[PDB]
Amino acid sequence: MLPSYDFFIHPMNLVELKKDIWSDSPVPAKLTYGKKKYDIDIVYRGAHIREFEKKSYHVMFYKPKKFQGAKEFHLNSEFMDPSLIRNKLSLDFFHDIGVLSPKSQHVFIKINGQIQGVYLQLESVDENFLKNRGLPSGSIYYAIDDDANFSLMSERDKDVKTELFAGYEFKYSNENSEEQLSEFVFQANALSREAYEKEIGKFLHVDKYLRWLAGVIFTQNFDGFVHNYALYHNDETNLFEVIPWDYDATWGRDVQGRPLNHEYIRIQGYNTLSARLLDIPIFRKQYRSILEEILAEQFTVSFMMPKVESLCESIRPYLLQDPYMKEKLETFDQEADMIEEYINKRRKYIQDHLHELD
Ligand SMILES: [Mg+2]
Numbered sequence: 069m070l071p072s073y074d075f076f077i078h079p080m081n082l083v084e085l086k087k088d089i090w091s092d093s094p095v096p097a098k099l100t101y102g103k104k105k106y107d108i109d110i111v112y113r114g115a116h117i118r119e120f121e122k123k124s125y126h127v128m129f130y131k132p133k134k135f136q137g138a139k140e141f142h143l144n145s146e147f148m149d150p151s152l153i154r155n156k157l158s159l160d161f162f163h164d165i166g167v168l169s170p171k172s173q174h175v176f177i178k179i180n181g182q183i184q185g186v187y188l189q190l191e192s193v194d195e196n197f198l199k200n201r202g203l204p205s206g207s208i209y210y211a212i213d214d215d216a217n218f219s220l221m222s223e224r225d226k227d228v229k230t231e232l233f234a235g236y237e238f239k240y241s242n243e244n245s246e247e248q249l250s251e252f253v254f255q256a257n258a259l260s261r262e263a264y265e266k267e268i269g270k271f272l273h274v275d276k277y278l279r280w281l282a283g284v285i286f287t288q289n290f291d292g293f294v295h296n297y298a299l300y301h302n303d304e305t306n307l308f309e310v311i312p313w314d315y316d317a318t319w320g321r322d323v324q325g326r327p328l329n330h331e332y333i334r335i336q337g338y339n340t341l342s343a344r345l346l347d348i349p350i351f352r353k354q355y356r357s358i359l360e361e362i363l364a365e366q367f368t369v370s371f372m373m374p375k376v377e378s379l380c381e382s383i384r385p386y387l388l389q390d391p392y393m394k395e396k397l398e399t400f401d402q403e404a405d406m407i408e409e410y411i412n413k414r415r416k417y418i419q420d421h422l423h424e425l426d
């Protein structure tokens with residue numbers, strides 16, 4: 069049974085929200101969940117997903133200050149995804165392969181008494197994300213533009229970046245956050261091949277980076293190497309790791325919603341940091357071992373498809389009650405087989421190319 073959320077948005081505030089859908093200015097609202105009521109602020113989120121009648125929302129809790137351990141969450145329509153499950157499937161997969169990852173759950177929402185349908189509630193990657201995992205304080209940075217590429221170089225300027233911390237929103241930060249990020253970006257690029265094995269681990273959690281890279285390769289987020297992630301600098305270990313975000317264009321479909329034909333991602337992935345690490349024999353062997361471990365445990369039909377089937381079964385009766393989705397249950401139903409075929413094809417490609425890491 070999906071959690072049912074009943075939102076109230078006062079008509080005056082709803083007019084303001086609908087006046088400029090591109091605005092990032094929130095309006096007050098209320099959430100009722102069971103018997104408990106929450107004063108909140110709500111705003112549309114995303115870019116192209118604002119064009120849909122089934123809008124996506126960023127919900128910020130005001131009073132009470134927290135909802136199930138969080139001060140905010142995201143409500144995605146996942147309308148581009150005919151399955152509504154690829155983002156959850158992906159982010160849970162990252163968790164299962166040992167990468168820090170947002171939790172998510174499907175929910176059923178109403179606004180002002182009118183069903184809006186099935187949404188994916190996504191955890192905000194912020195200080196509560198850390199606290200709820202027992203993780204140390206530190207900094208969280210969101211990749212927001214092309215300068216979040218792990219390089220010294222700005223593509224647009226065709227020159228060295230003016231600031232090496234460029235490309236990120238500082239979501240949770242302190243006085244050291246800029247310099248910590250700048251140092252990481254600089255050292256990722258400035259350490260020689262001969263110094264890399266002994267020194268990159270002073271700045272980067274290499275195993276967690278390689279597991280994130282593996283996750284991008286397995287899910288095939290074509291834009292996942294320089295976008296669609298957050299960085300976390302753990303202040304106790306002094307190391308960076310990478311947290312995925314926005315993984316709906318995965319498991320056999322691209323960002324336009326189209327089935328992949330013969331499009332694929334090479335197993336080495338992309339971005340300069342990946343390239344520098346995979347020039348190091350120890351790290352190439354480590355990465356190969358990670359891919360083999362995941363191929364043996366998580367990235368299999370036997371293991372993934374029960375999760376696909378459980379997600380679909382849990383939301384299907386609610387999709388029939390969703391005014392935007394009620395007509396495309398047949399297409400929805402066909403997505404499990406598409407994902408299964410993708411796993412089989414992707415497994416074969418990765419297995420066939422592991423020798424490139426030798
Ligand atoms: Mg608040």
Ligand SMILES: [Mg+2]
Nearest residue numbers: 248271306307
């Ligand atoms: Mg550090």
Ligand SMILES: [Mg+2]
Nearest residue numbers: 314316317323
């Ligand atoms: Mg996207």
Ligand SMILES: [Mg+2]
Nearest residue numbers: 343344346347
């Ligand atoms: Mg190389």
